[PDB]
Amino acid sequence: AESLELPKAIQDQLPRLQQLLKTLEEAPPVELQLLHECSPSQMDLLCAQLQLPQLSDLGLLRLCTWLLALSPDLSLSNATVLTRSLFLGRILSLTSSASRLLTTALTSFCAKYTYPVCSALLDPVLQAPGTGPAQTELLCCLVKMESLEPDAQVLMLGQILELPWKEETFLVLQSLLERQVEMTPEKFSVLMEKLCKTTSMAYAKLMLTVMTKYQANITETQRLGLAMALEPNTTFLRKSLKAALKHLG
Amino acid sequence: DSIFVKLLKISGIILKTGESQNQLAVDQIAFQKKLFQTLRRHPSYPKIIEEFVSGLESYIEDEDSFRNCLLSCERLQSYSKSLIKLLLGIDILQPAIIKTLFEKLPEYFFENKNSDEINIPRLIVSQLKWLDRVVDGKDLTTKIMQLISIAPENLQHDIITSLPEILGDSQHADVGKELSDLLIENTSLTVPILDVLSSLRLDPNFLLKVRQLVMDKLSSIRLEDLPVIIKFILHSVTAMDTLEVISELREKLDLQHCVSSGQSCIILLFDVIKSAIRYEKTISEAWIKAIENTASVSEHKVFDLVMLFIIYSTNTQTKKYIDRVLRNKIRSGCIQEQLLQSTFSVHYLVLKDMCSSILSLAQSLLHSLDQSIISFGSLLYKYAFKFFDTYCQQEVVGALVTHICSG
Amino acid sequence: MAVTEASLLRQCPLLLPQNRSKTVYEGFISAQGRDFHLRIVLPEDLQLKNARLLCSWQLRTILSGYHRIVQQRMQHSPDLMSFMMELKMLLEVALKNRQELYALPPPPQFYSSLIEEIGTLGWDKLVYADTCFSTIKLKAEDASGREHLITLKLKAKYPAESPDYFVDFPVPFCASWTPQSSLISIYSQFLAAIESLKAFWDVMDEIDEKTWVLEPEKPPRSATARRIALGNNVSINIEVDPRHPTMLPECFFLGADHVVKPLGIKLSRNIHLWDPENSVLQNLKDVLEIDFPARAILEKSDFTMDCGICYAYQLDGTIPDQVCDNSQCGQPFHQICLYEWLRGLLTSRQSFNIIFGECPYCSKPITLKM
Amino acid sequence: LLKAVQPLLKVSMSMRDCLILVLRKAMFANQLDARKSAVAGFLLLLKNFKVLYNSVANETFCLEIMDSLRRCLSQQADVRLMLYEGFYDVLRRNSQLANSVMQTLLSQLKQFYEPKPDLLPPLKLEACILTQGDKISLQEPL
C-alpha cells in the first residue's frame, strides 16, 4: 500500500530465504548477510513477507542462533523490528508460561542484543492489558539473567521508569533490584516519587527492598513520602516497614 | 518493670540479658500452668494479654535479647527447650504471638551469618514446629500463605520444605489447593512443592490435576530440574493412568529443544528413566504400546528409537515384540534413515554402553527379506563401526564376516 | 520526543545546529561519559544519501574498522535520529571490545583508605604491591604455619566494587562482597575458608614429609590427589576429602598383578580396622601392615623404575605403572608405549577395553586395561 | 538390607548424608511402613555410629533425631515397641546421650505412672488402650 520497494536483490533472494526458513523447521549462509542492505522499514515489510510470527518455537531458536552468529552487528532499528515480528505475537498470545525454547532463545537474543531486544519487548507487553503472570515471570527471568550486564540493568531500569506502574511493574522491579543495581540520585528520586503512590503487597516487597538496600541512597524527605505511603494497614509487614523506617532515621 | 517481665519473673524464669541462655527455676509445665492460672485469675483479664505482648515486642526490638528468647533455656536442677516454644504452648497468647512473629521477620531477608553463623529466619520457623496445640491453625495457614506468596526464593525453598513439621493432620486440603494455585503461576519451584505434596496428607484427584498442570508446564521448565520432575511423574503413575500420561509425555518430549548445554542433564534423565523401567516392568509394555499405536503418525520423533534400544538392552522377554514392531513400522515406511542419521549424530553417547544391543538387533534385521529392512540393518552396522570404539568396530567386522560366510 | 526539535535534544543534547537552516549541526556525542567532537553538514534537503561528516582524529582512529559501515548507514538510514542512535550503539560496542584502554583512580578515596586498610591487615601479611597499585598479594598462615598467598586486583575506586581475587586452594573460593567488607573482612573470609580445610593440610604435610611421595611433585595446596611409592615398582594413589580428610580417601594401586594382588587382599580385611582418629599414614601402616620406603631412595636412578619400551621415567608425566606378572622380568612399562607395541602384534587380542599379549622382554602373558 | 549395607556406611560419608535426607522425607510420608522403616534406619544409624564437620553439629543433629523420635513416640504402639527394642543397643554403643534417652523414657513413664502411695492402682491402664467407634487397640506398650 505504501509502495515500499524492498531492494531488488532481496526480492530475488526472497525464495532462497523462504526455503531456508522452511528448512530450519527440521551454520549461517550469506542469505542472512543480505539483511545489511535494508533500511529498517524494508526489514519491517520483509518480516511480514517471510511469516516470522508463523514460525515454530524450534525454528525461532535455530534462527536466533544464526542471527547471534552474524558478523557485523545488526542495526538498532532493524533488530528491534525483527524482535517484534519474532516474539511479540507469541508473547502477547501466552495464556500460560513460555516454553523453555522461547525462554532460552529470548535470553540469548537479549544477552547479545539486550537493549534493542527489551526496548522492543518490555514497554508494549506491560502497556498491554491482561498482562498475565506468565509474561511477568519471563521478564523476571530476563532481569535474573546472569548475562544481563550491569549497564544493561541500568538501561532496563531507565526504560522501566517512564511507564504506568502497576502490580506487574513492581513484581518485575523487585527481581530487577535484587541485583543491587546502581542508581543515580535523579533516578532514585523518580523511583521514590512513583513509589509514594498503593495497598499492593508486592509493592510492599518493593518498598521494603529499597528501604533495606538503598538506605545508602535514602534521605529524610524520601523517608517522609515513604511514611505517607506506609501509613496504610491494607499493607502487610507494617511493623517490619516501621522498623526499617526507624532504622533509616 | 514491664507487666511482661514481672509476670515471667514471678512465674520462675531468669530473664538473662541475651548473651547466655536464660535459666529456669521450675519444670516447663510448672512455669506454663503457673503463668497461665496467674493471668487467668488476674483482673484486667482480656487486656493483660495485649499489655503482655506489647511489652514482649518492646523487649525483642533488641537483637540479642530476642535471639536468646528464641534460643533454648538452661536448667538449674540438663538442656531444655526455648522460651518462645514454652510461650506458644499457651493458646490464649498464640494467635497474638503468631501475628507478632511474622510482621518483623521481613527485616531478616538480607541479614546473613553475622556472628555465630546461624540464620535467623530458619531459626524463627524452627520455633513453629511440632506444635502440640494450634488454636490458630487455619489463620496460621493463611498467614504463611501470604508469606509464601511473597517470600524470596531461598527462604521460600526452606519454609516450604519445613511445612510438614509445622502443620498437623486436618487442614491440608486448602493448603495443597493454594499450592497448586501457586504452581500454575510459578514453575521454578515445583520440586520442593512436589516433595512437600508427597509428604502431606492428600487426596490423589488433586495430584492428577497437578500432574496434568505440569505436563502442560513441561516444555516451559528449565533444563536441570526436568529429570527430577519426570522422576516425580513416574513415581506418581499407577497401573491404569499410565498409558495416557505416557502418551502426553511421548507427545511433549522433543529432545531437539534441549540445547555443556544439554548433555549432562539428558544423560541423567536417561539414567532416571533407565532406573524407572528397571525397577518396574509395565512402564515398558505401556511405552511400547504407545509408540506402537502411534501408527498414523508419520511425524515420529527421535525419542522413540532411543527408548526402543534401551528397552531392548534391558528386560528381554519382549525382544521378539520389539523386533516385530520395528519390522512393521519399517515396512510401513514410518521409520526411515535421516531419523537414524540425526539419532546417532547426537544421542550416541547414550548408546555407547549398549552397542551390543544394536548388533544383536541388526543380526535379526539382515536375516529377513524386504530390502529396506536389510538397508536399515546395514546403516546400523555402519554407524556402530563409525562412532563407537575399537571393540565395537571389531565386533562389527566379525558379525559382517559371519553374515558373509554363512548368510 | 517523536519530533526531532525535542528528540534530537533528548538523544544528542550535545549535538546542535549552527546554520540558520538546520543543515549545519555541530557539537558532541556522548559515549560511556565521553563527549567526542563532531561536525555534520547535511545537504539543502534532509537526505542522508549525502551527509558530510567530519570528526576528531580521536574518533576516526576509534572507527578504523567501521568506515564502510558508516558509508552503508549514512545512505540506508531513514532519519538522522535512528542514524545517530545506531551510531552510539556502535560506539559503545567498539569501546566494549577495546576495553583494554581504561583505568584512572580517584586518589583521596583510594590512595588514602588503602594504606589504612593495609595497617589494619598488617604490613607483614603484605608480600607484594604493583607499580600500578593494580595488583596486591597477601599472606595467610595455616595454624601449622603453611603460607597460602592470594592475589587481588583493584579497580579505580576499590571498595565500591569487588576486587578480582585469585587464590591457590582447590575449592571455589566465595568472598561475600559488601562495600562494608574491607581487606580484613575478606582476610577473615580467607581464614574461614582455610580453617574449613585446615585438618586436611595436617595430613597432607605429614604425607609430604614421611613417605616416597611420587606425582604431585612439589604438591601445591590445591592438590587433593596424591601418589605414593611402596615396595618396588608398585605405587598407590589417593584422593582425599578436604572436609573429612581422616575419613577413608578413595585409592587404588598401580603395579603388578602379583604385588598389587595381596595388597588389596590385606586392605579388604583391615579397612574395617580403619580408625579415623589417628593420622592417615599411621592408619595405613597397620591397614596395609607395612612400612613405606620413607624417601628410602627417593629420586635416585638404579634403572629399576624405567619403562623398558621408551626407557624413560615420567613419559608426559606418565609413570611406569604397567608391569609383568613374572618374578624373572618385573619389567615395568608405561601405558602408551605398551599399548602401541601390543597394537600391531598379531597375537594381541582385544576384549572390551583390554589388550592381551606377550611381555616384550620375557614373552609371558601380560594384560593391559585402558 | 540396611543391616547388610552397614559397612559401606561405616567407611563412607556422602552415602550416610543422602540416606539421612531420605529417612527425613520418609518419616512424614503418608504410608505407615515409611515411618516404621525410617525409624528403624535412624535406630541402626545412631546405634552403629558415634559420629553421623564439627562433632557438635553431629551431637545436636543426633539430638534433633532423638527429638523427632520423642515425638514419633506419640504414634501407635508398634512404633514405640520398635524404639524400645533398639534403645538398649543404642546405649550399649553410645552412652553419651543416656540423659536425653532416660529423660524421654521417664517422661513417657510418668505419663502412665501415678506418684502417690496408698493408691492401689499405681498406673493408668485405660490410658494405654484407645477405642474410636468400639474398635479397640493398645497404645504405648508399658
Ligand SMILES: [Zn+2]
Ligand atoms: Zn614409556
Ligand SMILES: [Zn+2]
Ligand atoms: Zn615380562
